[PDB]
């Protein structure tokens, strides 16, 4: 209540405070507790193999230099005080581009406690790398992590833990990605060794399951409809050369445009995906339908009836095998 | 352990310290050791002729002004101390855009040693130029370098070396580019002379080998399939003018769309690439197939049978010569 008294207390705390030295410098490591509140996952990019996360990132530690007596309150201080305090040198090892939000002020909090516990909160948006295995795309499940580490302090000097264990990360239910469901999240803690020493690591990972629905509609269904269209040829008279050759060409060429378009939406991976296998199967069907007419055409100068049954039935077999293997 | 003692020692080190003067100013050059830990190569752009690298960049040197006694520890200091110290004026001569990561703090380390050795680490993402020879594209091998130099200090004042020789750069095995394999990396050291004097240079280069698989699927296979499609014409009766002319047109025009699309994905180079040579060969085949019908059409008002053998066989020869020359 007495602001001169509080001002005096805080001034005394910061008098001769050396930001260069961690708490308990030269002694046992400072234990830093971390908890995350997820705000959003804005984007997941296959082409860039990354995702964009917004979170409230909070760090908990004790700095005995900041302990104060005679005030039974927790002091919430203006965020600019953070520039006069030691804070951990935490970074995101797999981040590509990150920033602290700055409107209307730097989205930063400092709360002091009488025992010298410092609560430091930041609102961060990060684009973080996530190598994806697209062999089963778009029936794939991905593991995207966020790796949290101390930049310069080894485990001799700093230690990390998930504050609250399995409850340290909240808001996973808020994530609303149209193309993915969050199946699971996990929290891991370990030490990572480099040439410069052993460093504390915390890892947050999510399991993302792609929703098929968009792909059924966008790629699978057009390919099915083109393949069915190709079969119309078999019910046309063999003398209708222009009509039946037109059907063959248009379906074959449409399947090429669909294939090439699709792979321009994705990174230039050297392996065959699940969707590639489907499109290649559909291409073979429609190409053989045109070749069937060439064969009919070739001899006329029963085969159509046999084509009318064998082609739809074989396509059913193809689909059965495909969707069983991958679903 | 005694933080007042450590604070006193460090304050004494920085008392009267002149950041303007290099260590041993006016004396022999300061030897700066450099080691790199590669985190990622995010992107390689043919259109922009550049690549994006993330690395941990560390500099080693001795500053006798910072030597301290009576403390048998290496002091890890808050990264903000870097602003009160001399550091080398290292830059990347072929970089296009670079930044030091800033979340949650500037990704920077300072470690002092009792003898006055300073360890200075930065986490940097750089987009760096890489002129590519695309004459054999996409069967090409590229050499992309990173050129490290002192901006303002000559070899009279500063010297660079790879700390650890051939082990100074780690993490090359981590690089996972879908479209490239890292064949080799090399470390070079030399002096570079400009009008303003001789400057120390370190060069890190990689040899990148393009993976063919994507290109086989995306461009080579469609072109093969269009060329085969063109041959169907030769099995159609010569009276089927609409059918056979349709085949000629559609294949010719499809090969033009494939060509023009492809070169819109690449820089506006004035020379012919390997892929251009293939597409031009395929164009000639399908164009001649249509011209073959014009010739048949021209006289009807044996040639088809001779076309049925000579065209596929010639395409096989064309492919044999091509893939031998380039693979």
């Amino acid at each position, epitope marked *: 209540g007495n602001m001169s008294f509080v001002k005096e207390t805080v001034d005394k705390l910061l008098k001769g405070y050396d930001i260069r030295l961690r708490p308990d410098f030269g002694g046992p490591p400072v234990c830093v507790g971390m908890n995350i509140d997820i705000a959003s996952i804005d984007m997941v990019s296959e082409v860039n193999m990354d995702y964009t996360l917004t979170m409230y990132f909070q760090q908990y530690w004790r700095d005995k230099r900041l302990a104060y007596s005679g005030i039974p309150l927790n002091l919430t201080l203006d965020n600019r005080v953070a520039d006069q305090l030691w804070v951990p040198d935490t970074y995101f090892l797999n981040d590509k581009k990150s920033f602290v939000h700055g409107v209307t002020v730097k989205n930063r909090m400092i709360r002091l406690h009488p025992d010298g516990t410092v609560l430091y909160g930041l609102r961060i948006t990060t684009t973080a790398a996530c190598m994806m295995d697209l062999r089963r795309y778009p029936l794939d499940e991905q593991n995207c992590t966020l*790796e949290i580490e101390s930049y310069g302090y080894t485990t001799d000097d700093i230690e990390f833990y998930w504050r609250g264990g399995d409850k340290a990360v909240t808001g996973v239910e808020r994530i609303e990605l149209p193309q993915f469901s969050i199946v699971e999240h996990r929290l891991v803690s370990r030490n*990572v*060794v*480099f*040439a410069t020493g052993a460093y504390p690591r915390l890892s947050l990972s999510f399991r993302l399951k792609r929703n098929i629905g968009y792909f059924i509609l966008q790629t699978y269904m057009p390919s099915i409809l083109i393949t069915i269209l190709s079969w119309v040829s078999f019910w046309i008279n063999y003398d209708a050369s222009a009509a039946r050759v037109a059907l063959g060409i248009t379906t074959v060429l449409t399947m090429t445009t669909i294939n090439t378009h699709l792979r321009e939406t994705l990174p230039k991976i050297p392996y065959v995906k699940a969707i590639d296998m489907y499109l290649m199967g559909c291409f073979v069907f429609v190409f053989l339908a045109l070749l069937e007419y060439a064969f009919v055409n070739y001899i006329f100068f029963a085969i159509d009836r046999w084509s009318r049954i064998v082609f739809p039935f074989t396509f059913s077999l193809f689909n059965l095998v495909y969707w069983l293997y991958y679903v | 352990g005694n933080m007042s003692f450590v604070k006193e020692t460090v304050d004494k080190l920085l008392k009267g310290y002149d950041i303007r003067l290099r260590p041993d100013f006016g004396g022999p050059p300061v030897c700066v050791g450099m080691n790199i830990d590669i985190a990622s190569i995010d992107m390689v752009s043919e259109v922009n002729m550049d690549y994006t690298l993330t690395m941990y960049f560390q500099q080693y040197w001795r500053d006798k002004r910072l030597a301290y006694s009576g403390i048998p520890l290496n002091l890890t200091l808050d990264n903000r101390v870097a602003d009160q110290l001399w550091v080398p004026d290292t830059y990347f001569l072929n970089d296009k855009k670079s930044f030091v990561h800033g979340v949650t703090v500037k990704n920077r380390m300072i470690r002092l040693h009792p003898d006055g050795t300073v360890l200075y680490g930065l986490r940097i993402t750089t987009t760096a130029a890489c002129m590519m020879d695309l004459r054999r594209y996409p069967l090409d091998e590229q050499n992309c370098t990173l050129e490290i130099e002192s901006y303002g200090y000559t070899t009279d004042d500063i010297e660079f070396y790879w700390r650890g020789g051939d082990k100074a750069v780690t993490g090359v*095995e981590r690089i*996972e580019l879908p479209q490239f*394999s890292i064949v080799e990396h090399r470390l070079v050291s030399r002096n570079v002379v400009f009008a303003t004097g001789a400057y120390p240079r370190l060069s890190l280069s990689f040899r990148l080998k393009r993976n063919i698989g994507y290109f086989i699927l995306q461009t080579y296979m469609p072109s093969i399939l269009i060329t085969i499609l063109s041959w169907v014409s030769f099995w159609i009766n010569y009276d089927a003018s609409a059918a056979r002319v349709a085949l000629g047109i559609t294949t010719v025009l499809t090969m033009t769309t494939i060509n023009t699309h492809l070169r819109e994905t690449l820089p506006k180079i004035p020379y012919v690439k390997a892929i251009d040579m293939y597409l031009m060969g395929c164009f000639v085949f399908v164009f001649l197939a249509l011209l073959e019908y014009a010739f048949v059409n021209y006289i009807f008002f044996a040639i088809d049978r001779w076309s049925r053998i000579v065209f596929p066989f010639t395409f096989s020869l064309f492919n044999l010569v091509y893939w031998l020359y380039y693979v």
Partner: nanobody
Amino acid sequence: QVQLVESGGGLVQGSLRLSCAASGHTFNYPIMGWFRQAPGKEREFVGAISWSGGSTSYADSVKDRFTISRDNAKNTVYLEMNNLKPEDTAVYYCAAKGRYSGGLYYPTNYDYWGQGTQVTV
């Protein structure tokens, strides 16, 4: 979750080919390492290979003697131990490293350890 079974050790006086067959989620663990533990001594780095690309690295002791490579079809890595020496007498272990799990050289960075073939010469 990776399982590693190694075979082809044994006792010889000579060229040898240790093999290391992986199965499971190998995508999350792109690097395979070879270690060896002599009796008494600490567990020691031999070499490592990336599954994708085959980017290889060796300890000095075995540089230009041993050669590692792999085949992704079988999910198999092999240490081709040529030009053997009586220093090369240890339980050779295979291990998998996570993508972000640190330096190649440090066995504590590795999670999934093979059984370990004893090799004496």
